[PDB]
Design an enzyme around this catalytic site. Structure first.
Site: not given
Ligand SMILES: [Zn+2]
Ligand SMILES: [Zn+2]
Lengths: 374, 374
Positions: B93, B270, B308, B310, B313, B339
């Site tokens: 930015d 963002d 999820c 990820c 998880c 996460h």
């Molecule tokens: Zn997750």
């Protein structure tokens, strides 16, 4: 196939030994350094990162875990290993030290009553309850519950605490052996007490070897005595322990303390230094510790240590880590901690290799000459 | 082989688009969410972890980096990518927003003088100096330097700030184009201003398209207007921008804001929400955000979100993360942040796939019905 607990010495040089402890959840290479995982986390590290640095076993603090998140809660959540995601061996201390050093204490022969340092809730510990909590955690190496005596310790107080500790070591033995699942899958260590007094250390050793333990810890050191007195105490205390069992110096310590203790027969170590110092901006290097916040690192593109194989030293500069630490950034704590733990494991590896090759005396000399050139 | 900047739209549904931005350091899949890397770190994450969640590009804050560690210092340390260990595109930015919102401000047509919020040191920013700093950082997508007007904004103040911003957009263009290495390897985005006023938004758009930019940001939203007014402003503002260039809504936002903005033609986002909320104990799930500190999660063995993918998880429970957050543990911040960022990237992936398959309208309905059932 793996045994409950089998210590085997592969090589020796003087009083130093190297070998392996085989347990159901994995093999521990000795001399071993255990990263400290206080409240079910090695602070700022995922378990996989702890393992990637070379750690074979970590330590959990029974006093903290019983206050938060709670011992029964951890059992209900399938035990400490599953809870925190570390599937290799875990040694749990007895909690007796933190009761003295952290809690608001009634002490008696039955046990101890104290108030939590977090919220004033009332708790109790005893030989039987400490063994039970370590069982609820699922601990692999269980520490007998003892009575710590503050530093400095008068002979009467050192002998008072030691004798009660040896009575508690027998009660710890019995409590451990009464619980079949624990006695078949875990190991039990006894703790030598007796302060700086040779006669008390010897009576302690005799009492513990009479009871019988899987390993023997040297208690009551790294509490203010300085390295010279600690080494002098180790000189006569370690040979009192059974030779064919592991020797565990609790709470030690700085790299040079570790080398000197291995020279005197110690096989296992734990310390918050690599983790806590890392978060505070101190990095261990073969040339001594450095304070990464110092202005001289602000544009230094070299890694924290020029020989370190850890992922931090492979990827980031001193200048970057200097910036993160001075900015208070979490990633600064993460990178400093991973490097420091990896440095400790590389030290243990060099110790083990040099003993195996019969050049540990030369390694210790070489290490000190460079580490204290600074 | 890779081009400097090539935006290609592969599929559309109503006003929504999906496609790719090809740049020298990598391909950006759009609609894209950029994790925010304030002071050369996405807080509590290694760059490799940021990438593992699916992020194609991150954002750096010019105002923070110029105060610490310093723009010239970063150039001397080989630029931002090398410094922090992220080798994919970075958007920076302009710093103009944080000057208004964080610093102690003289403002004029030349630029702005301000005192650092960290130590009172005096700094300056202008169109030319902001472009130069973003060049010293090595930024891949450069933002024109504009003048932000606080919220709420009177018409005169909104038009005042907008008109000066458009003059500064021309100066940003020229400063960018004067520096050959920057103009051949980076891209330049212009920022539409004009608050909630349709006529001012249109004059802003015309001025920017007259100058010519690689992409166009919608500025002046997510500053207090609420979602209804933001959507109403997007309804008439986005069609004013060139259709064949990316559209970037700065500082947005909550998952449902993102979906609604994509429905109105936005390609890039963002927000500090996934990172900052994570450290504070808020986890995003397909069933809405949850406050992991709540007592109802103390023994919940399910992952943060049941769908999820990820690594958090896959490996740890709500109960464990509940304990870490309540204990203040760094690993709690790490796991919550990973996460949350992975959840945002999975949202963007589902958005892109549903647009590609012409079922984005159904996805948006389905998303809201479940996310706001809570
Ligand atoms: Zn997750
Ligand atoms: Zn290292």
């Amino acid at each position: 196939d793996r045994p409950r607990f089998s210590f085997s010495i592969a090589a020796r040089e003087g009083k130093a030994r190297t070998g392996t402890i085989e347990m159901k959840r994995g093999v521990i290479r000795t001399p071993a350094f255990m990263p400290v995982g206080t409240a079910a986390t090695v602070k700022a590290l995922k378990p996989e990162t702890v393992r990637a640095t070379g750690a074979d076993i970590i330590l959990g603090n029974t006093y903290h875990l019983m206050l938060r998140p709670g011992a029964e809660r951890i059992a209900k959540l399938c035990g400490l290993h599953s809870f925190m995601g570390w599937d290799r061996p875990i040694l749990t201390d007895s909690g007796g030290y933190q009761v003295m050093s952290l809690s608001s204490l009634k002490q008696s022969e039955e046990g101890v009553t104290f108030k939590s340092h977090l919220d004033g809730s009332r708790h109790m510990l005893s030989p039987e309850r400490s063994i039970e909590i370590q069982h609820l955690l699922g601990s692999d190496i269980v520490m007998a519950f003892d009575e710590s005596t503050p530093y400095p310790a008068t002979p009467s107080r050192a002998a008072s605490s030691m004798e009660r500790s040896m009575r508690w070591a027998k009660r710890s033995r019995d409590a451990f052996d009464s619980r079949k699942e624990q006695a078949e899958n875990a190991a039990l260590f006894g703790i030598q007490q007796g302060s700086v007094f040779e006669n008390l250390r010897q009576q302690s050793a005799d009492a513990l070897a009479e009871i019988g333990f899987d390993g023997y810890a040297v208690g009551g050191l790294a509490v203010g005595e300085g390295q010279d007195e600690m080494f002098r105490v180790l000189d006569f205390s370690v040979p009192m322990l059974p030779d064919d069992k592991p020797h565990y110096l609790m709470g030690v310590g700085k790299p040079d303390d570790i080398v000197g203790a291995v020279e005197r027969g110690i096989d296992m170590f734990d310390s918050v230094l690599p983790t806590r110092s890392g978060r505070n901006g101190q990095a261990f290097t073969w040339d001594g510790p450095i304070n990464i916040r110092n202005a001289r690192f602000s544009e230094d593109l070299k890694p924290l240590d020029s020989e370190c194989h850890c992922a931090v030293c492979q990827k980031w500069s001193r200048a970057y880590i200097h910036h993160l630490i001075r900015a208070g950034e979490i990633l600064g704590a993460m990178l400093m901690t991973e490097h420091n733990i990896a440095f400790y494991q590389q030290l243990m590896q060099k110790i083990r290799d040099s003993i195996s090759e019969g050049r540990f005396s030369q390694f210790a000399q070489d290490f000190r000459a460079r580490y204290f050139a600074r």
